[PDB]
Amino acid sequence: ELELDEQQRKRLEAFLTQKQKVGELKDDDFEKISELGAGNGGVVFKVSHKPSGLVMARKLIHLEIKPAIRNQIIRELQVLHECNSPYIVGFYGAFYSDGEISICMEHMDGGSLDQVLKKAGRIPEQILGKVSIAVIKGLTYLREKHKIMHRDVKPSNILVNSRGEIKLCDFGVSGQLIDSMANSFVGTRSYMSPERLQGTHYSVQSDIWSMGLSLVEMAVGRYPIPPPDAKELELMFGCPMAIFELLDYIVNEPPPKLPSGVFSLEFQDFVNKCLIKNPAERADLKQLMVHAFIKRSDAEEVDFAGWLCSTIGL
Numbered sequence: 001e002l003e004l005d006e007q008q009r010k011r012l013e014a015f016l017t018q019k020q021k022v023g024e025l026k027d028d029d030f031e032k033i034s035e036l037g038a039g040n041g042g043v044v045f046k047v048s049h050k051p052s053g054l055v056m057a058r059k060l061i062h063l064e065i066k067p068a069i070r071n072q073i074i075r076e077l078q079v080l081h082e083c084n085s086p087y088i089v090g091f092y093g094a095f096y097s098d099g100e101i102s103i104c105m106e107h108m109d110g111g112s113l114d115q116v117l118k119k120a121g122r123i124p125e126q127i128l129g130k131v132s133i134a135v136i137k138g139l140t141y142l143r144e145k146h147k148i149m150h151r152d153v154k155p156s157n158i159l160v161n162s163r164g165e166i167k168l169c170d171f172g173v174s175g176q177l178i179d180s181m182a183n184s185f186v187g188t189r190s191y192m193s194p195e196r197l198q199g200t201h202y203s204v205q206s207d208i209w210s211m212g213l214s215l216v217e218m219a220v221g222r223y224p225i226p227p228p229d230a231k232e233l234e235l236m237f238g239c240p241m242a243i244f245e246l247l248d249y250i251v252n253e254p255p256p257k258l259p260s261g262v263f264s265l266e267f268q269d270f271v272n273k274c275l276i277k278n279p280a281e282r283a284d285l286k287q288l289m290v291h292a293f294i295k296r297s298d299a300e301e302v303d304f305a306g307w308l309c310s311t312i313g314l
């Protein structure tokens with residue numbers, strides 16, 4: 001199920017061939033073109049690598065650690081030259097300079113689902129059908145070919161492009177970048193599974209929880225917890241809480257659900273199986289790959305690119 005079609009292998013050859021030409025990356029070959037976003041640990045720019053004339057996204061993680069330290073992150077990050085899939089954001093390289101690590105990657109012109117959502121109000125189920133397939137394959141790719149678990153699925157980490165492509169970024173490839181960062185730097189745990197917030201055991205089932213959580217959010221047009229009190233719904237389809245108060249909700253209350261009557265039963269069952277609190281019972285990748293919603297969604301020929309440009313003005 002990880003086979004590429006012809007239009008995918010070609011895009012993959014194209015990318016590599018462009019990459020082949022990029023020598024060693026250095027601060028001075030880059031020129032800011034715009035700011036794509038900021039995070040609780042770094043910034044991201046749409047930049048032009050002058051020599052090659054390549055546009056990229058430059059993530060600058062302004063975290064400070066001795067050249068001794070930062071050289072291990074850069075080491076495990078080199079693994080990204082091995083992550084070639086249609087569902088994974090392309091990587092150009094990583095270097096240190098100015099007390100900040102730079103991770104340069106393929107530029108996704110449609111932005112993150114994060115922003116697609118803000119623009120669109122809510123994403124139609126058939127679209128989320130393709131997003132679901134893409135995440136499932138992205139995580140199946142990373143597990144099968146690199147024994148990696150994503151670790152941070154959320155709408156801001158699923159990126160799309162005018163070619164109708166859906167790819168994942170920000171996955172836990174370097175454990176050292178994880179600790180060297182996930183220390184004096186937090187990044188929202190609001191899409192973390194109950195088991196990871198409880199400290200307990202955690203596999204790719206945790207990533208499945210976050211995907212399910214994200215899909216409900218994208219489907220309804222709002223971060224789903226706590227639940228939209230019935231009258232909140234009539235305004236929605238016709239038909240506050242501090243961080244710590246919320247994470248506690250997740251661990252102690254029943255998982256979110258899609259409002260009924262509005263979405264198909266296959267799609268409700270799909271998210272319900274992702275949102276199962278006990279990891280042992282919640283579906284896994286192999287099961288989700290053959291879920292009715294995924295099989296129906298695949299055979300569907302949805303024009304993701306059309307819908308996208310039409311919605312964000314692309």
Ligand SMILES: Nc1ncnc2c1ncn2[C@@H]1O[C@H](COP(=O)(O)OP(=O)(O)O)[C@@H](O)[C@H]1O
Nearest residue numbers: 036037038039042044057106107108111112156
């Ligand atoms: N490869 C990319 N192409 C386009 N935009 C990107 C890319 N990578 C990151 N971004 C943008 O950067 C914003 C913030 O990046 P980030 O620092 O990872 O914080 P979060 O991921 O917590 O938003 C993201 O929401 C996204 O819009």
Ligand SMILES: O=C(NOC[C@H](O)CO)c1ccc(F)c(F)c1Nc1ccc(I)cc1F
Nearest residue numbers: 039040041042089103169170171172173174
């Ligand atoms: O960048 C990461 N998380 O978010 C960072 C902050 O939000 C900055 O604001 C992150 C965490 C662990 C890890 F191992 C990585 F490799 C990371 N970055 C990262 C991963 C894959 C690709 I393709 C490109 C990337 F850039």
Ligand SMILES: [Ca+2]
Nearest residue numbers: 027028097098
């Ligand atoms: Ca410089």
Ligand SMILES: [Mg+2]
Nearest residue numbers: 156157169170
């Ligand atoms: Mg991100």
Ligand code: NA
Nearest residue numbers: 027028097098
């Ligand atoms: Na610089």
